[PDB]
Write a protein that binds this ligand. Structure first.
Ligand SMILES: *[C@@H]1O[C@H](CO)[C@@H](O)[C@H](O)[C@H]1O
Ligand SMILES: *[C@@H]1O[C@H](CO)[C@@H](O)[C@H](O)[C@H]1O
Ligand SMILES: [Ca+2]
Ligand SMILES: [Ca+2]
Ligand SMILES: [Mg+2]
Ligand SMILES: [Mg+2]
Lengths: 568, 565
């Protein structure tokens, strides 16, 4: 068995997204907190997680549960103190974990000192945000028009009138989330200042949110006005409704990538000047594949985020997908990613329905196997390691500003992100062990007695035990250094093979369909029989250690196997 | 390497007969014309030809409106000319496929006249529905549903004779058969049996996505409205106004196709000789397209449905990563054992060099010839023919006439891809002795013609010949494929086969020079020999590639011959 050089930590980490409000409540207020995370850092070691990122924990009025940041240099009081954060870093680092911070560079709370100073036209802050005059209305001079038809992601105009300043400010998100002017060198310098502060504290890097919205059209390019976004011309949207416009002037502007490349320059300089393990930036943006790959860098030699997140398992695959769709979407990242790009795989987050809800309850293990066996970085969202489902959230219990703004009692479910933010299922105790109180900030999902971590640790076969076996398998040279081959055997079943001369072969077989499928293992490259089941889905006929001798393999709907075969 | 049945790796050439060769100076291509140039297919290294329809037709849709599925269109010639074409093609080793459209018949067909007059056994040959009353103006009949014709306007036409609407997914003159009528399904078997008895090597079957529409029996006796697109740019008479939920890709259409294949399998068993095939045409999403091959329940359909991805999903707007990702789509979705095919043009779409670029013609023909399976060539692609200019005044395409006007006809017209074939630099590019050609000859025929390309050292046609010859190599018939983008500008396609020479396409699909590391290309050992280069390449056939660093100019494609793996 050949010797392999270990990869840089960020090229093949298991990265786990914590939603701190919903992870662990240590003080009975029904709100997850830093002492809660600290008390369960051992969970990440137990799970085989290398790195955690937290949804925002900075001072925030909580309009968008942390994404409206009023102070980028201190901790939100409900989550705890700077001292709790420093204790979290110390204890995480002692356990060998990396810790990344999430913040949204696009915007600040209207309660931030930046915005208070800006609205007052304070020297240094007047132009910190996008401030615009009304569009001249010569035909009805007493009727004030917004600068353009731009629509907020949370509904209504992206322009809010300031009585104090007698101008509109831009908010691509909530009224309380004010868009920085990213053509302002002082805004760009402030972003370096924020990152330097948290790197100096010992953060191992950043997840940076909402990057497609950084830059909007310069009125200088449109005869001194903000240009209207083109109309979608879809009958089902009026001017206050997201979908009314195509964001040609408000999203994916080529200038945003220059800001990202400057962030990478800054981080490269920081790493050179501090040594120890590489500090990284992982970018978030929902965009088409071309716009997504520009986050890595460009073919003029620019270098950007260590990677942009791959949301293809959220946006392009679901329970509607067959095995050919799975393979074809997996191939999209691998086909479009630049030479030397690190692939990553995301199955969920706090903005989207949970993995088993988007797919099916019988597919959890197969989805975690894909995550863990594809080359590069596995990304796990809080709860995927135990197969948590969307929780039921009534209109009455809904707190997501997106649903409160865009929805009503009949439609709120089309918008609300709350079902994927329900408290983590630790055990079958009061509130699934998330809290000692029956009062939790979102309702605990009704299935917690059936789906909880403690039950999965006790029972012979579980989502969590499969998760542990897969994160353990990623330490094998075959998964860190091995080649990959992926093809559909049928509309129902695909294989993913990891192989490496002189090292064991590992094969995923996954029936993603609602029907049984019999496949010819003779078609699977590098699969020599007999082979051993390393991992099986929790209801597979095959237990771990089951010998596969026949070339004919019948798989149930949703059944997934990892086979261990002799080296190539 | 066991010999493949002919249709698994044939070079298939689509003839548009009206535009191929005029033998009789009426400016209309004809069968004696085709017969006179059958040697062209041998010269080019074409194995099989299919013709756009040549059956009796009022020519409203230039042959796709068929008034008699059992005889030849007089302008193209006679049954005897067809029998001669088959005779001489088979002598030259060629296969000949007939195109007919099972979906619809000419309103001048006996089927229609008899159906409209309610003649017994013909009453239900076509889709006949009652009008709806009109809230706005009671005197004005409304059609059975909001269904929109592929050529614009309602898919329902009123018959004064029958006092009912008939369905036409295409032209008013193209009447949709009822494919739930066993007598209609029998008549298709009768038409196929007739032409297979004549010696045809199989069929191209048109417009299959449109065979079957919603049964009113499943909608309380009414034809259900297609959903609205809700797109403000489309009015109720314009294609795009509806989503064809009840009018296209109904699962029942595939059962008809599986029955056709069952009939052909029986015929092939009972007659022996060379396999007679069915290749299906349908523009549909990839999963609905794959159902034409067969289904997972074990149904067997068309020998293959045509792959239109180089028409629908790639263009001059595409980068190397797009090329790779779109090529992977057929290869990812195709059933195990399926034959891949590659289509770069047809008589319904702009010519290959117009959709892409003039400097990409060689690369595109290399892709066609070097990918696994079947290369499909549309008349003109072997010489890099460009779209012809066709004024409103000279436009004869019903689609442009019905959907378009002097300022918009170019958005819809298929005529630019149907201009006469460029044989030489003689009158009408040698298509005809006459200057009275049914469509105007493209302005560039003096620059782009088969004769010129045969007598210049380097040409699209000589590259085409080099590539059809290369398909005889086991590496291309049986070899593995590896395909990846080296950059946004350049991709490789490697064919490899243990102990047989490796063949490598490098293609810069961009408008800019690109320098690639050939060390990244699998199975490529240097030195390698240029087998084929783009006509504008600095590299000639026989040139040795010795450096690992290769600069490709805009549109430049090389086929390298390299050491066996
Ligand atoms: C990215 O950004 C928006 C606004 O900050 C937030 O609502 C989402 O939760 C986040 O992923
Ligand atoms: C398929 O069918 C339509 C109608 O018959 C025709 O106009 C096209 O030319 C053909 O490819
Ligand atoms: Ca912005
Ligand atoms: Ca039909
Ligand atoms: Mg708490
Ligand atoms: Mg003629």
């Amino acid at each position: 068995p050949t010797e392999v050089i270990q990869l840089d930590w960020w090229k093949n980490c298991v990265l786990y997204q914590i939603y701190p409000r919903s992870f662990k409540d240590s003080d009975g207020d029904g709100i997850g907190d830093l002492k809660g995370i600290i008390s369960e850092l051992k969970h990440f070691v137990d799970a085989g997680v290398d790195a955690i990122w937290m949804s925002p924990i900075f001072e925030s009025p909580m309009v968008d549960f942390g994404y409206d940041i009023s102070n980028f240099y201190d901790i939100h009081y409900e989550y705890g103190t700077m001292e709790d954060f420093e204790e979290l870093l110390d204890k995480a680092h002692e356990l060998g974990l990396k810790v990344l911070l999430d913040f949204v560079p696009n915007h600040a709370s209207n309660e931030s000192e930046y915005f208070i100073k800006s609205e007052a036209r304070e020297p240094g802050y007047e132009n910190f945000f996008i401030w615009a005059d009304p569009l001249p209305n010569p035909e009805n001079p007493g009727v004030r028009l917004p600068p353009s038809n731009w629509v907020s992601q949370f509904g209504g105009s992206a322009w809010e009138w300031s009585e104090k300043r007698q101008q509109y400010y831009l908010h691509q998100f909530a009224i309380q989330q004010v868009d920085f002017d990213f053509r302002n060198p002082a805004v760009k310098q402030e972003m370096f200042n924020i990152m330097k502060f948290w790197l100096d504290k010992g953060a191992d890097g950043f997840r940076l949110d909402a990057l497609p919205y950084l830059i909007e059209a310069d009125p200088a390019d449109h005869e001194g006005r903000y240009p209207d976004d083109p109309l979608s011309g879809l009958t089902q949207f009026e001017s206050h409704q997201l979908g009314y416009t195509i964001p040609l002037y408000t999203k994916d502007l080529i200038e945003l990538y220059d800001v990202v490349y400057e962030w990478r320059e800054f981080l490269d300089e920081y790493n050179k000047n501090h040594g120890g393990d590489t500090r990284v930036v992982f970018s978030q943006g929902y965009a088409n594949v071309s716009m997504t790959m520009l986050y890595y860098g460009n073919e003029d030699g620019a270098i950007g985020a260590h990677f942009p997140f791959n949301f293809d398992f959220i946006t392009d695959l679901s329970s509607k997908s067959n095995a050919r769709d799975f393979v074809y979407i997996i191939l999209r990242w691998l086909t479009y990613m630049p030479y030397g790009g690190i692939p990553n795989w995301v199955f969920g987050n706090h903005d989207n329905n949970r993995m088993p809800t988007r797919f099916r309850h019988d597919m959890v293990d197969g989805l975690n196997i894909i995550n863990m066996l594809l080359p590069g970085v596995a990304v796990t969202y809080q709860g995927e390691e135990i197969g948590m489902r969307d929780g039921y959230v009534s209109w009455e219990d809904t707190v997501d500003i997106e649903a409160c703004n865009r929805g009503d009692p009949d439609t709120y479910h089309l918008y609300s992100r709350d079902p994927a933010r329900t408290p983590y299922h630790w055990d079958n105790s009061t509130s699934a062990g998330f809290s000692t109180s029956t009062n939790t900030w979102l309702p605990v999902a009704e299935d917690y007695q059936e789906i909880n971590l403690a039950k999965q640790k006790e029972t012979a076969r579980s989502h969590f035990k499969n998760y542990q076996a897969l994160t353990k398998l990623r330490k094998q040279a075959t998964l860190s250094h091995g080649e990959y081959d992926i093809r559909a055997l049928s509309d129902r079943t695909f294989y993913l093979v990891r192989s490496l001369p002189t090292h064991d072969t590992y094969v995923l077989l996954f029936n993603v369909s609602e029907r049984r499928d019999t496949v010819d293992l003779g078609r699977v490259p590098h699969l020599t029989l007999p082979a051993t089941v390393y991992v099986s889905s929790i209801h597979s006929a095959r237990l771990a250690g089951h010998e596969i001798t026949s070339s004919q393999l019948s798989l149930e709907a949703g059944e997934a196997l990892v086979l261990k075969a002799q080296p190539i």
